[PDB]
Tab-separated table of C-alpha atoms in Angstrom:
chain	number	residue	atom	x	y	z
B	1	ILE	CA	-1.421	-40.482	-28.638
B	2	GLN	CA	-3.938	-40.008	-31.431
B	3	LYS	CA	-5.489	-36.664	-32.464
B	4	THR	CA	-7.971	-35.989	-35.293
B	5	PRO	CA	-6.999	-33.746	-38.201
B	6	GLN	CA	-9.095	-30.607	-38.586
B	7	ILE	CA	-9.404	-29.636	-42.266
B	8	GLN	CA	-9.993	-26.343	-44.012
B	9	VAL	CA	-10.179	-26.043	-47.832
B	10	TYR	CA	-10.000	-22.521	-49.217
B	11	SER	CA	-8.578	-20.287	-51.901
B	12	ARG	CA	-5.702	-17.866	-51.162
B	13	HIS	CA	-7.612	-14.926	-52.788
B	14	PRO	CA	-11.342	-14.126	-52.960
B	15	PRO	CA	-12.611	-16.453	-55.681
B	16	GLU	CA	-13.471	-15.107	-59.115
B	17	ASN	CA	-14.538	-17.353	-62.012
B	18	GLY	CA	-12.072	-16.791	-64.875
B	19	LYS	CA	-9.353	-15.418	-62.538
B	20	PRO	CA	-6.378	-17.666	-61.572
B	21	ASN	CA	-5.900	-18.587	-57.908
B	22	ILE	CA	-4.394	-20.909	-55.314
B	23	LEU	CA	-6.472	-23.582	-53.564
B	24	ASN	CA	-5.374	-24.555	-50.060
B	25	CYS	CA	-5.994	-27.601	-47.941
B	26	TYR	CA	-4.851	-26.670	-44.435
B	27	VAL	CA	-4.740	-29.639	-42.024
B	28	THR	CA	-4.069	-29.176	-38.331
B	29	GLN	CA	-4.357	-30.453	-34.772
B	30	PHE	CA	-3.203	-33.948	-35.691
B	31	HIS	CA	-1.181	-36.797	-34.227
B	32	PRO	CA	0.563	-38.861	-35.188
B	33	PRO	CA	2.553	-36.983	-37.779
B	34	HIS	CA	2.000	-39.518	-40.601
B	35	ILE	CA	-0.840	-38.214	-42.810
B	36	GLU	CA	-1.839	-38.627	-46.446
B	37	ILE	CA	-3.238	-35.647	-48.339
B	38	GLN	CA	-4.712	-35.511	-51.823
B	39	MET	CA	-6.316	-32.583	-53.678
B	40	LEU	CA	-9.006	-33.585	-56.104
B	41	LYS	CA	-10.566	-31.960	-59.115
B	42	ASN	CA	-13.876	-33.346	-60.369
B	43	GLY	CA	-12.958	-36.520	-58.418
B	44	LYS	CA	-9.634	-36.862	-60.235
B	45	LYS	CA	-6.437	-36.452	-58.261
B	46	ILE	CA	-4.611	-33.156	-58.978
B	47	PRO	CA	-1.038	-33.802	-60.077
B	48	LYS	CA	0.939	-30.714	-59.136
B	49	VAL	CA	0.196	-30.339	-55.436
B	50	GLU	CA	2.690	-28.684	-53.128
B	51	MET	CA	3.051	-29.543	-49.466
B	52	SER	CA	4.521	-27.275	-46.803
B	53	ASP	CA	4.726	-26.091	-43.196
B	54	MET	CA	5.526	-29.644	-41.999
B	55	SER	CA	5.790	-28.804	-38.268
B	56	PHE	CA	3.820	-28.476	-35.065
B	57	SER	CA	2.564	-26.024	-32.480
B	58	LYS	CA	2.843	-24.983	-28.863
B	59	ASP	CA	0.252	-27.624	-27.893
B	60	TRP	CA	2.410	-30.211	-29.745
B	61	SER	CA	-0.179	-31.066	-32.408
B	62	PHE	CA	0.957	-31.171	-36.022
B	63	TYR	CA	-0.216	-29.388	-39.147
B	64	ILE	CA	0.463	-29.008	-42.851
B	65	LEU	CA	-0.531	-26.809	-45.839
B	66	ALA	CA	-1.080	-28.541	-49.223
B	67	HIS	CA	-1.839	-26.288	-52.226
B	68	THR	CA	-2.234	-26.193	-55.987
B	69	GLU	CA	-2.945	-23.678	-58.749
B	70	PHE	CA	-6.461	-23.336	-60.143
B	71	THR	CA	-9.091	-21.256	-61.898
B	72	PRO	CA	-12.439	-21.255	-60.138
B	73	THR	CA	-15.318	-21.996	-62.509
B	74	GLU	CA	-19.079	-22.543	-62.249
B	75	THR	CA	-18.880	-26.269	-63.056
B	76	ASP	CA	-15.682	-27.583	-61.529
B	77	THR	CA	-15.702	-29.229	-58.119
B	78	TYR	CA	-12.779	-29.298	-55.825
B	79	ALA	CA	-12.056	-31.235	-52.665
B	80	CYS	CA	-9.323	-32.382	-50.273
B	81	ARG	CA	-8.908	-35.965	-49.041
B	82	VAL	CA	-7.137	-36.664	-45.753
B	83	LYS	CA	-5.991	-40.119	-44.700
B	84	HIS	CA	-4.929	-40.369	-41.042
B	85	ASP	CA	-4.796	-43.266	-38.438
B	86	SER	CA	-7.056	-41.456	-35.974
B	87	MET	CA	-9.998	-42.237	-38.344
B	88	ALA	CA	-11.361	-45.371	-39.980
B	89	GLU	CA	-11.836	-43.865	-43.440
B	90	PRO	CA	-10.256	-40.862	-45.135
B	91	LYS	CA	-12.186	-37.628	-44.960
B	92	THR	CA	-13.048	-35.743	-48.138
B	93	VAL	CA	-13.866	-32.034	-47.629
B	94	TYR	CA	-15.314	-30.154	-50.659
B	95	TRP	CA	-14.386	-26.533	-51.280
B	96	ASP	CA	-17.175	-24.144	-50.161
B	97	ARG	CA	-16.202	-20.728	-51.492
B	98	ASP	CA	-18.184	-18.385	-49.275
B	99	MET	CA	-17.913	-20.343	-46.104
H	1	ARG	CA	21.007	-20.178	-34.160
H	2	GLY	CA	19.653	-23.410	-32.753
H	3	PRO	CA	19.925	-25.139	-29.398
H	4	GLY	CA	22.261	-28.115	-28.759
H	5	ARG	CA	21.318	-31.298	-26.900
H	6	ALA	CA	24.934	-31.309	-25.579
H	7	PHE	CA	24.616	-35.136	-25.409
H	8	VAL	CA	22.437	-34.882	-22.307
H	9	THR	CA	19.793	-37.552	-22.950
H	10	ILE	CA	16.454	-38.399	-21.284
Y	1	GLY	CA	6.191	-5.359	-28.929
Y	2	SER	CA	7.906	-8.745	-28.582
Y	3	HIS	CA	9.560	-11.222	-30.984
Y	4	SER	CA	10.896	-14.729	-30.923
Y	5	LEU	CA	13.344	-17.276	-32.299
Y	6	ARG	CA	11.845	-20.783	-31.833
Y	7	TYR	CA	13.160	-24.216	-32.860
Y	8	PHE	CA	10.743	-27.087	-33.470
Y	9	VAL	CA	12.419	-30.487	-33.482
Y	10	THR	CA	10.823	-33.865	-34.238
Y	11	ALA	CA	12.093	-37.468	-33.935
Y	12	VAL	CA	9.815	-40.306	-34.975
Y	13	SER	CA	10.877	-43.938	-34.550
Y	14	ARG	CA	10.104	-46.361	-37.360
Y	15	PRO	CA	11.003	-49.972	-36.463
Y	16	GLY	CA	9.468	-51.198	-39.739
Y	17	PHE	CA	11.101	-48.521	-41.911
Y	18	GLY	CA	14.622	-48.010	-40.398
Y	19	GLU	CA	16.369	-45.468	-38.110
Y	20	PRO	CA	14.359	-42.480	-36.826
Y	21	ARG	CA	13.309	-39.678	-39.066
Y	22	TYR	CA	14.705	-36.522	-37.489
Y	23	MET	CA	13.884	-32.890	-38.356
Y	24	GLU	CA	14.648	-29.382	-37.139
Y	25	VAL	CA	12.577	-26.334	-38.056
Y	26	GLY	CA	13.616	-22.745	-37.142
Y	27	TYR	CA	11.204	-19.769	-36.894
Y	28	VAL	CA	11.326	-16.014	-36.301
Y	29	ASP	CA	7.740	-15.120	-35.313
Y	30	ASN	CA	5.310	-16.862	-37.756
Y	31	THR	CA	8.073	-17.158	-40.355
Y	32	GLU	CA	9.958	-20.375	-40.996
Y	33	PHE	CA	13.555	-19.622	-42.059
Y	34	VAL	CA	15.560	-22.936	-41.630
Y	35	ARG	CA	14.941	-26.676	-41.951
Y	36	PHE	CA	16.828	-29.926	-41.384
Y	37	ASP	CA	15.535	-33.264	-42.715
Y	38	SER	CA	16.988	-36.709	-41.997
Y	39	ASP	CA	15.455	-38.272	-45.095
Y	40	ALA	CA	16.757	-35.645	-47.535
Y	41	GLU	CA	19.157	-36.484	-50.398
Y	42	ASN	CA	22.018	-35.003	-48.307
Y	43	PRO	CA	20.769	-33.843	-44.921
Y	44	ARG	CA	21.919	-30.337	-44.042
Y	45	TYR	CA	20.488	-27.138	-42.578
Y	46	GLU	CA	18.747	-25.248	-45.384
Y	47	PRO	CA	17.392	-21.698	-45.841
Y	48	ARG	CA	13.598	-21.325	-45.977
Y	49	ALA	CA	13.546	-17.528	-46.041
Y	50	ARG	CA	15.765	-15.351	-48.252
Y	51	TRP	CA	16.991	-13.097	-45.446
Y	52	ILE	CA	18.915	-16.057	-43.915
Y	53	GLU	CA	20.557	-16.751	-47.299
Y	54	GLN	CA	23.047	-13.953	-46.330
Y	55	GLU	CA	24.886	-16.347	-43.982
Y	56	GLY	CA	28.337	-17.750	-44.642
Y	57	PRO	CA	29.439	-21.369	-45.149
Y	58	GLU	CA	30.440	-21.705	-41.502
Y	59	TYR	CA	26.812	-21.055	-40.587
Y	60	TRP	CA	25.388	-23.924	-42.682
Y	61	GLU	CA	28.031	-26.429	-41.575
Y	62	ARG	CA	27.867	-25.450	-37.881
Y	63	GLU	CA	24.100	-25.897	-37.804
Y	64	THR	CA	24.321	-29.132	-39.820
Y	65	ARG	CA	26.875	-30.345	-37.189
Y	66	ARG	CA	24.563	-29.281	-34.365
Y	67	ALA	CA	21.634	-30.989	-36.123
Y	68	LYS	CA	23.713	-34.146	-36.650
Y	69	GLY	CA	24.783	-34.037	-33.004
Y	70	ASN	CA	21.186	-33.634	-31.888
Y	71	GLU	CA	19.770	-36.545	-33.905
Y	72	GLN	CA	22.153	-39.011	-32.164
Y	73	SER	CA	20.869	-37.908	-28.769
Y	74	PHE	CA	17.258	-38.317	-29.992
Y	75	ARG	CA	17.837	-41.870	-31.226
Y	76	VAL	CA	19.119	-42.658	-27.725
Y	77	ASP	CA	16.253	-40.751	-26.113
Y	78	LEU	CA	13.685	-42.646	-28.130
Y	79	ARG	CA	15.017	-46.042	-26.874
Y	80	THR	CA	15.307	-44.811	-23.263
Y	81	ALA	CA	11.632	-43.765	-23.355
Y	82	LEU	CA	10.752	-47.277	-24.570
Y	83	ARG	CA	12.274	-48.687	-21.367
Y	84	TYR	CA	10.619	-46.008	-19.221
Y	85	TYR	CA	7.068	-46.817	-20.428
Y	86	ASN	CA	7.470	-50.572	-20.904
Y	87	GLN	CA	6.444	-50.520	-24.566
Y	88	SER	CA	7.055	-52.830	-27.496
Y	89	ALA	CA	9.700	-51.999	-30.074
Y	90	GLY	CA	7.490	-52.330	-33.159
Y	91	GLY	CA	5.381	-49.222	-32.555
Y	92	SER	CA	6.290	-45.909	-34.165
Y	93	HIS	CA	6.747	-43.328	-31.406
Y	94	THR	CA	7.555	-39.631	-31.272
Y	95	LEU	CA	9.722	-37.211	-29.326
Y	96	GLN	CA	9.250	-33.476	-29.963
Y	97	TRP	CA	11.324	-30.616	-28.554
Y	98	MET	CA	10.565	-26.851	-28.720
Y	99	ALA	CA	13.308	-24.447	-27.628
Y	100	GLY	CA	13.686	-20.712	-27.892
Y	101	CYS	CA	13.318	-17.167	-26.707
Y	102	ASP	CA	10.708	-14.417	-26.702
Y	103	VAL	CA	12.392	-11.000	-26.205
Y	104	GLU	CA	10.610	-7.738	-25.408
Y	105	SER	CA	10.939	-4.375	-27.163
Y	106	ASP	CA	13.573	-3.130	-24.731
Y	107	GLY	CA	15.773	-5.990	-25.963
Y	108	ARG	CA	15.503	-7.854	-22.668
Y	109	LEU	CA	14.409	-11.462	-22.494
Y	110	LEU	CA	10.674	-11.822	-21.979
Y	111	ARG	CA	10.754	-15.627	-21.760
Y	112	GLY	CA	13.030	-18.622	-22.424
Y	113	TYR	CA	11.737	-21.971	-23.660
Y	114	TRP	CA	12.991	-25.586	-23.571
Y	115	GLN	CA	10.439	-28.402	-23.400
Y	116	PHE	CA	9.692	-31.867	-24.755
Y	117	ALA	CA	6.680	-34.079	-25.342
Y	118	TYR	CA	6.673	-37.831	-25.991
Y	119	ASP	CA	3.986	-39.233	-28.304
Y	120	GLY	CA	2.249	-35.809	-28.299
Y	121	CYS	CA	1.963	-35.454	-24.505
Y	122	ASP	CA	4.016	-33.164	-22.283
Y	123	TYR	CA	7.131	-34.833	-20.916
Y	124	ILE	CA	9.497	-32.349	-19.279
Y	125	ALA	CA	9.749	-28.568	-19.331
Y	126	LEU	CA	12.253	-25.972	-18.178
Y	127	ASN	CA	10.145	-23.741	-15.903
Y	128	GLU	CA	10.077	-19.986	-16.660
Y	129	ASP	CA	12.625	-19.576	-13.836
Y	130	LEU	CA	15.097	-21.382	-16.124
Y	131	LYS	CA	16.494	-23.407	-13.265
Y	132	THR	CA	14.036	-26.165	-12.327
Y	133	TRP	CA	12.083	-28.705	-14.414
Y	134	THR	CA	8.441	-29.791	-14.402
Y	135	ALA	CA	7.338	-33.310	-15.341
Y	136	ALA	CA	3.999	-35.112	-15.330
Y	137	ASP	CA	4.337	-38.878	-14.918
Y	138	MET	CA	6.993	-40.767	-12.939
Y	139	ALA	CA	9.153	-41.549	-15.952
Y	140	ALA	CA	10.103	-37.935	-16.637
Y	141	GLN	CA	10.876	-37.425	-12.946
Y	142	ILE	CA	13.566	-40.005	-13.741
Y	143	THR	CA	14.617	-37.534	-16.472
Y	144	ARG	CA	14.158	-34.606	-14.081
Y	145	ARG	CA	16.267	-36.404	-11.458
Y	146	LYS	CA	18.888	-37.365	-14.061
Y	147	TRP	CA	19.199	-33.859	-15.573
Y	148	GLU	CA	18.805	-31.971	-12.272
Y	149	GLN	CA	21.805	-33.861	-10.880
Y	150	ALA	CA	23.886	-32.976	-13.967
Y	151	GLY	CA	23.312	-29.193	-14.027
Y	152	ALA	CA	21.552	-29.211	-17.400
Y	153	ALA	CA	19.579	-25.965	-16.874
Y	154	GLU	CA	22.694	-23.740	-16.619
Y	155	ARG	CA	23.901	-24.487	-20.159
Y	156	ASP	CA	20.301	-24.460	-21.454
Y	157	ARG	CA	19.574	-21.231	-19.633
Y	158	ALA	CA	22.838	-19.803	-21.062
Y	159	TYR	CA	21.639	-20.441	-24.629
Y	160	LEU	CA	18.149	-19.015	-23.953
Y	161	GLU	CA	19.628	-15.876	-22.316
Y	162	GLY	CA	22.677	-15.454	-24.540
Y	163	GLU	CA	22.958	-16.753	-28.125
Y	164	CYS	CA	19.225	-17.032	-28.792
Y	165	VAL	CA	18.793	-13.285	-28.058
Y	166	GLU	CA	21.759	-12.122	-30.138
Y	167	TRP	CA	20.872	-14.350	-33.074
Y	168	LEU	CA	17.235	-13.219	-32.877
Y	169	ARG	CA	18.553	-9.661	-32.598
Y	170	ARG	CA	20.620	-10.238	-35.744
Y	171	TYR	CA	17.801	-12.041	-37.571
Y	172	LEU	CA	15.250	-9.325	-36.671
Y	173	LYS	CA	17.529	-6.558	-37.935
Y	174	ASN	CA	18.443	-8.494	-41.114
Y	175	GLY	CA	14.863	-9.540	-42.009
Y	176	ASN	CA	13.288	-6.174	-41.316
Y	177	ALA	CA	11.604	-5.877	-44.764
Y	178	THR	CA	9.428	-8.935	-44.052
Y	179	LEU	CA	9.709	-9.720	-40.345
Y	180	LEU	CA	9.221	-6.066	-39.801
Y	181	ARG	CA	5.970	-5.456	-41.589
Y	182	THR	CA	2.437	-5.271	-40.148
Y	183	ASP	CA	-0.351	-5.956	-42.608
Y	184	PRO	CA	-3.768	-5.061	-41.241
Y	185	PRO	CA	-6.657	-7.409	-41.988
Y	186	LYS	CA	-9.162	-6.425	-44.683
Y	187	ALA	CA	-12.528	-7.186	-43.005
Y	188	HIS	CA	-16.124	-7.587	-44.152
Y	189	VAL	CA	-19.354	-9.290	-43.134
Y	190	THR	CA	-21.383	-11.673	-45.265
Y	191	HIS	CA	-25.109	-12.491	-44.856
Y	192	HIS	CA	-26.404	-16.109	-45.057
Y	193	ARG	CA	-30.161	-16.688	-45.082
Y	194	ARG	CA	-30.549	-20.030	-43.280
Y	195	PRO	CA	-33.312	-22.526	-44.153
Y	196	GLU	CA	-34.546	-22.323	-40.552
Y	197	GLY	CA	-35.698	-18.708	-41.133
Y	198	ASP	CA	-32.693	-17.094	-39.454
Y	199	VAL	CA	-29.476	-15.460	-40.690
Y	200	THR	CA	-25.825	-16.376	-40.332
Y	201	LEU	CA	-23.606	-13.287	-40.215
Y	202	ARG	CA	-20.013	-14.085	-41.110
Y	203	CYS	CA	-17.177	-11.766	-40.116
Y	204	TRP	CA	-14.058	-12.050	-42.259
Y	205	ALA	CA	-10.475	-10.927	-41.799
Y	206	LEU	CA	-8.049	-11.413	-44.743
Y	207	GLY	CA	-4.436	-10.372	-45.680
Y	208	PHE	CA	-3.134	-9.890	-42.160
Y	209	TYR	CA	0.246	-10.291	-40.642
Y	210	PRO	CA	1.273	-11.224	-38.148
Y	211	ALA	CA	-1.136	-14.070	-37.545
Y	212	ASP	CA	-2.279	-12.684	-34.155
Y	213	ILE	CA	-5.828	-11.290	-34.333
Y	214	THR	CA	-9.082	-11.119	-32.303
Y	215	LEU	CA	-12.580	-11.284	-33.800
Y	216	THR	CA	-15.733	-10.882	-31.652
Y	217	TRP	CA	-19.476	-10.443	-32.117
Y	218	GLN	CA	-21.655	-8.101	-30.023
Y	219	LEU	CA	-25.270	-7.276	-29.193
Y	220	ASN	CA	-25.848	-3.732	-27.843
Y	221	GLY	CA	-22.508	-3.975	-26.054
Y	222	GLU	CA	-22.718	-7.676	-25.195
Y	223	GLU	CA	-20.063	-10.317	-25.917
Y	224	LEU	CA	-21.992	-13.278	-27.349
Y	225	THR	CA	-19.622	-16.244	-27.192
Y	226	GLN	CA	-22.539	-18.693	-26.898
Y	227	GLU	CA	-23.768	-17.849	-30.394
Y	228	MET	CA	-20.282	-17.540	-32.005
Y	229	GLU	CA	-18.487	-19.988	-34.280
Y	230	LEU	CA	-14.949	-19.042	-35.327
Y	231	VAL	CA	-12.371	-20.866	-37.436
Y	232	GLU	CA	-8.758	-21.514	-36.666
Y	233	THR	CA	-6.538	-18.768	-38.213
Y	234	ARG	CA	-5.049	-20.168	-41.419
Y	235	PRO	CA	-2.413	-19.197	-43.955
Y	236	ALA	CA	-3.250	-17.878	-47.429
Y	237	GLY	CA	0.158	-19.295	-48.367
Y	238	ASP	CA	1.693	-15.949	-49.345
Y	239	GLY	CA	2.852	-14.764	-45.919
Y	240	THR	CA	-0.552	-13.384	-44.948
Y	241	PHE	CA	-3.326	-14.971	-42.856
Y	242	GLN	CA	-7.097	-15.421	-42.722
Y	243	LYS	CA	-9.833	-15.921	-40.165
Y	244	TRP	CA	-13.570	-15.683	-39.790
Y	245	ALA	CA	-16.200	-15.687	-37.033
Y	246	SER	CA	-19.943	-16.289	-37.317
Y	247	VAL	CA	-23.131	-15.661	-35.425
Y	248	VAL	CA	-26.716	-16.869	-36.033
Y	249	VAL	CA	-29.062	-13.918	-35.730
Y	250	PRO	CA	-32.847	-13.636	-35.913
Y	251	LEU	CA	-33.781	-12.198	-39.335
Y	252	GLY	CA	-34.576	-8.517	-38.991
Y	253	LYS	CA	-32.326	-7.942	-35.963
Y	254	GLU	CA	-29.048	-7.886	-37.940
Y	255	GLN	CA	-28.491	-4.130	-37.493
Y	256	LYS	CA	-27.872	-4.798	-33.766
Y	257	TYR	CA	-24.907	-7.202	-34.156
Y	258	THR	CA	-21.315	-6.043	-34.478
Y	259	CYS	CA	-17.998	-7.640	-35.367
Y	260	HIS	CA	-14.941	-6.208	-33.583
Y	261	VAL	CA	-11.492	-6.683	-35.123
Y	262	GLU	CA	-8.331	-6.225	-33.083
Y	263	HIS	CA	-4.956	-6.428	-34.848
Y	264	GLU	CA	-1.550	-4.840	-34.335
Y	265	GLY	CA	-1.662	-3.467	-37.888
Y	266	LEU	CA	-4.892	-1.618	-37.083
Y	267	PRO	CA	-4.621	1.942	-35.756
Y	268	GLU	CA	-7.889	1.436	-33.863
Y	269	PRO	CA	-9.961	-1.749	-33.555
Y	270	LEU	CA	-12.549	-2.097	-36.320
Y	271	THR	CA	-16.280	-2.457	-35.688
Y	272	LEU	CA	-18.384	-3.843	-38.553
Y	273	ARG	CA	-22.115	-4.251	-39.104
Y	274	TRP	CA	-23.904	-5.867	-42.036
């Protein structure tokens, strides 16, 4: 009927400042399927952001993996913004590297 | 190879 | 061990945007290998894994036909459900279907699947017996009645026992350099001094495939589920997976806690301490 998206933001490889990497925004357990995802850098929307795994699971909930290329640094801030009808406002989750 | 609905609806 | 060929199908009505968006996604274990999208520039079954790219033209047109056949039935189905639940025709609704087979190592069929959900809730499922249905309202008993009268299960149960198995058998043997691979998790524990004066021990597992894994924390041989936070297994995006589990421990008693890691790629389960 309506299920809240769980969000995880994380890099594909252990983060190293200087070293290139892939930042992921993995969104799951949601319903309905319509969802709006944005990956943000220093509050600005990241332009080349790939979306994938548009499907669902055994329990019927839906999920999706958005990702983009990046180089961790000591000053840059990254986050993922999810817009979904189960919630009033969109939810912004900042990247926490050693979560 | 996928499954077919075989035109058997709900 | 066991494997599987599963198809995940979605149909979402959109009264304010046009006919229903319809998609089909095929998987062999945790590996997508085919996709069908209504809204594409020229809807057709497409390869999502390179090992399926070794299939002839007949294969891509047969599946496209089958997908095109299927979507028509789903459009119908959507509207029938509308009648069944007495709902307005302005609201976007959904019908999902998951069908497939899990076969054992001996080649035999471990389990056959063929179920549907409407708007995210169970609707009707082909019991494990692959003969009788199971519904949970009084609208899908209408569907159970309807289909039971028609002899639907036989044909369904013929696909789950026949074609699904052989095609999985062919896919497994043709995707053996990916499908057949077991990457063990690299694991490690981190230490997080909490402001409250206690420590958060975090147990990590990275680079593993398949996605199936178990992570647990212990205290002198004591499963402490109370104290343990764990995240949902997620993809790194490269074919491997990640997961972590945490426990809040009194500072100075860390030595005593242990993280246990069970994965198919591991010769013996790992046990980690900080």
